Amino acid sequence: FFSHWTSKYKERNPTEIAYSEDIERIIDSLVTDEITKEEIIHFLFGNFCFHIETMNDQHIADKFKGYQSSCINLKIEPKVDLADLKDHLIQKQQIWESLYGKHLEKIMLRIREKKKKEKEIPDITTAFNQNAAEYEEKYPNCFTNDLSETKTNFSMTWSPSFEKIELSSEVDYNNAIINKFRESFKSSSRVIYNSPYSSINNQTNKARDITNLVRLCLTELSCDTTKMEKQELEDEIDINTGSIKVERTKKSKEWNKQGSCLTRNKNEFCMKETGRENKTIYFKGLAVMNIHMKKLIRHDNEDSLSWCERIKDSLFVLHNGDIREEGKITSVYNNYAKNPECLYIQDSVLKTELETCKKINKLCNDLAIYHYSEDMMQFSKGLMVADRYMTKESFKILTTANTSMMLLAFKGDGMNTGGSGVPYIALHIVDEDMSDQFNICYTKEIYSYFRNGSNYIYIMRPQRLNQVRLLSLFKTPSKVPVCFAQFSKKANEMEKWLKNKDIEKVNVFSMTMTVKQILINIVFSSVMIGTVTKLSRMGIFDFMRYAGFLPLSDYSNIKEYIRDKFDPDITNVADIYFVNGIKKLLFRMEDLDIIGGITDLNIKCPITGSTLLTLEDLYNNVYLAIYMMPKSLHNHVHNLTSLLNVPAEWELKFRKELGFNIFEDIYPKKAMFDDKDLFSINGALNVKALSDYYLGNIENVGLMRSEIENKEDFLSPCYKISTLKSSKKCSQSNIISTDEIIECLQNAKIQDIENWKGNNLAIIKGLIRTYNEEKNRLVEFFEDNCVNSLYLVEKLKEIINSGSITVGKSVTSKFIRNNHPLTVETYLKTKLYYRNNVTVLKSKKVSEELYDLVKQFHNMMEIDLDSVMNLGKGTEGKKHTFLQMLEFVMSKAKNVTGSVDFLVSVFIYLMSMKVKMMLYFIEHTFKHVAQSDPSEAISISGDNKIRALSTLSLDTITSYNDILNKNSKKSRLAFLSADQSKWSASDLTYKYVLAIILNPILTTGEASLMIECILMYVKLKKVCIPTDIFLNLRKAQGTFGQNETAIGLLTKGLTTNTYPVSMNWLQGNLNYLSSVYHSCAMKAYHKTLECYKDCDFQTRWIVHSDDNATSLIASGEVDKMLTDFSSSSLPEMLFRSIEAHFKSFCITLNPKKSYASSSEVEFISERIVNGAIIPLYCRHLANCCTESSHISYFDDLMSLSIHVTMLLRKGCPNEVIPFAYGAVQVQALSIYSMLPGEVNDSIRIFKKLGVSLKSNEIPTNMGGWLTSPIEPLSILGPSSNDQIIYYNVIRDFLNKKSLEEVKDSVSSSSYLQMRFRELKGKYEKGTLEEKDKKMIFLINLFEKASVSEDSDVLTIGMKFQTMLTQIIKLPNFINENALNKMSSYKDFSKLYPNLKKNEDLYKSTAKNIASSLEMESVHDIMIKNPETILIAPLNDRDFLLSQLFMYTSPSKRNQLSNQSTAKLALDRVLRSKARTFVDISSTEKMTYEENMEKKILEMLKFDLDSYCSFKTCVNLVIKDVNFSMLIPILDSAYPCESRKRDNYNFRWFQTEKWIPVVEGSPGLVVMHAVYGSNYIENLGLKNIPLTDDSINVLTSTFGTGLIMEDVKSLVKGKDSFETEAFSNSNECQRLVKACNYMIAAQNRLLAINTCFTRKSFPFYSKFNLGRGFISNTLALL
């Protein structure tokens, strides 16, 4: 172990760091009445003398010099010798050790003072009544007993039953329904208005208006079109971004002319030229939709439960008469659920489970679950399509696969600025038989009805829906059938009735009344849960995650949670059913193998099905009801204001508590270190606790320092660090300069009104738009910022008085949204000098910021080629380290920079590059400290062992309780599952300095650097609100009474943007240091509890930042000490004592999610009771239906199959797995890669062109369907589907039986050439069988759509986790708009000027006069330095021009252009049906399906010279270690009943193929297990040679393309070119594979040693660092 001091800061002490008086205040504030200042200093600087056994002697001299300097600067006489300090610190030990007993007495007094003040509620009903009483006390008379003023019961949209077959013959089936309703709505006027909820005083007077509006819109304002063209969209260039989807200017944006009406497309109509009485009727109907006063019903309303107990069974009657049999959602769900035998390889033993799944599918078919979900999905489609394009004088009649359903959509909030939603009136035709049940069910929203024929025509009430609510309505086919399947499985009456009957006898007719009632509840709950669009239902359902703990003890959650902080916001009826289910569960728990519920007689909360055989069924039902709700139905505008509003309040609370005023700095005070309640710690106890923690954790200072400076990439340049190189995002305050602003104002003349070209017109527009209403501040900015005062304003006078200028109005958000960003910059900056300063932080990549930092380190600001190339080559040139750049940044910004670097923004938080580097240093010097702690969970690599540590924390605790309580005394268990509240907001930050001073694995210079870093992070941090949000609050504050909650007080009345956030580190920034402090606090808790005299306590705790998993086992005289601690049992003891102890460590325990029990613990989401773990597969099942990224079909299908895989891991039953398959299929296919029957299908396209591939053999990237079985998807993952179909077509191609025959036939090198020649001859003369055409198709697909194709991992870093990739990559930007606003492009465009800057066509013309010379120079200084463009930067001049030589490849600007951005819905369902661009430069615009047709027609021919990709695709499949041993196990596995499996329910999968396959690869003994598998299954050991040699072939071709063209067999000389010409013999890839298969050189790298050999043939082996890298078979563990 060698020691290296990594600082120029060596001669700096922690008491001379500019912000050094705060350390003096911390020292002065730690002085107690028993410990003086001298002992505090001697302990704090000198604690390292307990660690002096593993550190160097130069480290000894360094730390003793730091000790002496600290004592001299603090006016204390230091000890002369190190042994003198050791003797003094070992003799003043009992003074410091006595703090634990006083702390024990303090927490006992705090429990005694806290339990006396609280009040006790007698029962749960009194808690509910007290909540209702205080709710009436806030707002009086808010509770109404009349059910006529409430909100809508049955949510956004209503689905009647569809009773008549509608024949179509030349009548356009979508349009025949509209004229059917029109001819129904032409009879007389027997309009009966509906009184809601059987009321008597019906006002009406609006039902007449709605009826007249609907009659007008269906009689006069619309007609049978049947001839107009469909809506077609086209991509267009935006003035701020690229490639947005919009309607074309002609055709589908123009109003056509039918007979006396105006029409746009097949659905939209208009009334621009209509009679005045008709216009009056239209406006009278429009005024209804608007184009305390809360009536909340009580929890104990017996009328609402009685009404719901008729509404929810009228719904079941309505869900029982539908006659439709085929559809889109029905087809995809019946692909998996109607025949689930294909998913399971050994399906012959699942004769009961698969039959139950088939019965659940038949019940879904007969109750019209699929058809209702499909109707909701397409109506949400049509509704948001209507939301963006509708005007006030137009409507958008929607029709679907329905028979008796329409919707009359009206003007919504196009160009979304929050808004309210899109109005819509739905019409229904119901027959005479189901007429009373329709009135009973939808009694609130039926607005008028009349009778025509044997039918009733219903007009329902208009509502409105935001885009988020339409998106939650969209995922109905993914959310409702899985709800029906899970609730039908977990209900024991439903499953019990399903098990006796047969598939031909399952119907509603042969049902008992109890099973029918359970089915009614299941249908109603699935409908109400799968589509949720109300905030009250979300409040009710996330109230449910705390009122659901049965096996419990004292938690302060049964009664004190249902008091004041519970919000009973029940607005409608029939959520009384859900709240009443909660109330019955709580009343049951009040009156009091896991068998938890066969004896308690528990009741399901949403589905009410009794006789619960297992507690895990209850946990699964509640948590699936919880996790299926959306994250938020609020807009991003409201959510961002909430996220920017919480820290302002939690900082104003801190300032008010500790006496700081609003506009001043933050310094330590005595109150923070005096053991107070709100914002304080104990002080001297914290120092002793941290010293004891560092004594007990760090065992070798030098070895751990070596691991820190070797594994965290210290003493290495910053581009080797993945956090500071991989472009996440960043924040750099780029503001147009004020001198540049006044210069642009000066050069903007008044004689060039026509010639206002360039970007200066944007500055002119911004200053004029600011002048139009903000005259008060523009004169101040024009007279104080610039030295010329009157000239600028007098020039602006005739600038506005020039007559012609393009400004409409200060429309605020309408100006911001669709104008150039520098217009926003100027419209800000001309009124921001002394107030409202903003200083807008625009986002940037960290790679560009690191590029600028490396450029600024070597003083190469102005870019010059000789200046960068003079830095040397190889591993002997100029190179920096991470800490040298860190101190360069610190020395730069300590020089009066204005503290612009400490500015974060919300985009979860967006910090600067400096703050990212300081947080990296502080984070990763404590990551290894937390890695040495066995009780620390955030240091666990991944989520794999997170469950494992909880398993140990249960197992050793239970084993020790079994080993102690049987001998001498009694023991009581106490498991704590705490979660702290405001872990970052309420936390004192200055206590982290004490964790750094006492750190022994450090240096007195590095410690000073970290202390100064944390002190500037506290004293100078600020938060900048974004421009649109701050303008919204500014205009709201101007219109209103000018008061705000906390943001107005912090920003001096909203007159400035940056508000101070000092003692609140942002969440995720200190995630290891806070966890270290938490574990230190728990060790101090154990040391404090060890001070009790006649009792023995041992504590086991587990810490992951915010969370806690404390266990405690007491022994001895328990009965006396329990009333000493003021409690009744050990969980009550633990919940009181830990809460009292944590207040001395600035940790706030909240009595909401923190419970204490004697048998149950929870950690994050996993949960283990009495040595057995409850599975909780709810999160993955909900992620299978709700969470998606919305980027592509391939990406989202591969991402959702992760959740399917973890569903298979965590014990899912075998009847929800086919529904999980169907759910991920609907969620992947329902946006862009369209559903069966639509335009972007892949079964239909492959069937039309006669492709030889079958339905279940289409690859995933071809738009095909996930058809991998249960076992290979569970073991390998989503990347196994294409591997399985490739292996199947290969095994059919060479006509073999097993994989081993294929392996020993491929292993001969003279075999695949003969097969390829035989295939070529077969294609030649006369014969091509089906297998040959399949093999040819997949060979050409591997050529055209391999994952390595058109990708390099050094421009954008990818991971290569699959075999193939997306074959259409839509460009997010067109031309060089993606490459702009970049320092790399601005440098590349300067030393290589506009001959090669603008544009891609100018560079492409240099491949067939000055651009050819520039390209020749580029590739001449590129090909002489080969290591700079296709490996990682070895040093500088391998990084600064590595970012410069990537803007020359056509496939490296395309890769940066089509980067996957976030976007949202309606930007991808519209782009899929639009004529999109192909690449970065093409005049041709073509659709997605036509592109797919062209690509499939391209990959149909044999295309000889395809031998290399044939051998590559064979060898990528067969050579996998995991696949080649998983397949023979699956092929030769015994069914059951010998050692594999003998149980039935949820015990085939976890007994037959996840334990005899885990005795397969690593060998194992355990029988039943929930699996956290190994790392990712590697299919990228062979693909990173493909990328790293494809880029070599590309630069070879682009180097050889200038001087000459040639074909082959080149004779030129100049060895680096002749050897690459010999390298390009066939493709260079078969040469790569064969040549480095038959030898293995493996020469080391020094870039002169390796360039000594040859530039081409053995050099490429040192551009991947490995060859034929075969991994080991992964242990599932």
Ligand SMILES: NC(=O)c1ncn([C@@H]2O[C@H](COP(=O)(O)OP(=O)(O)OP(=O)(O)O)[C@@H](O)[C@H]2O)n1
């Ligand atoms: N992005 C939008 O279009 C939108 N959505 C809701 N809002 C807020 O609510 C009002 C109604 O929106 P509009 O801009 O369509 O109404 P308008 O201003 O009276 O009509 P117009 O566009 O023809 O001038 C608007 O005045 C505005 O305050 N704006």
Ligand SMILES: NC(=O)c1ncn([C@@H]2O[C@H](COP(=O)(O)OP(=O)(O)OP(=O)(O)O)[C@@H](O)[C@H]2O)n1
């Ligand atoms: N009630 C609690 O016991 C609790 N648990 C966490 N927190 C801290 O609260 C900050 C923001 O709260 P959020 O609105 O994001 O939800 P949350 O974290 O789940 O807390 P809560 O249950 O109170 O809503 C978050 O920064 C979070 O750390 N409070």
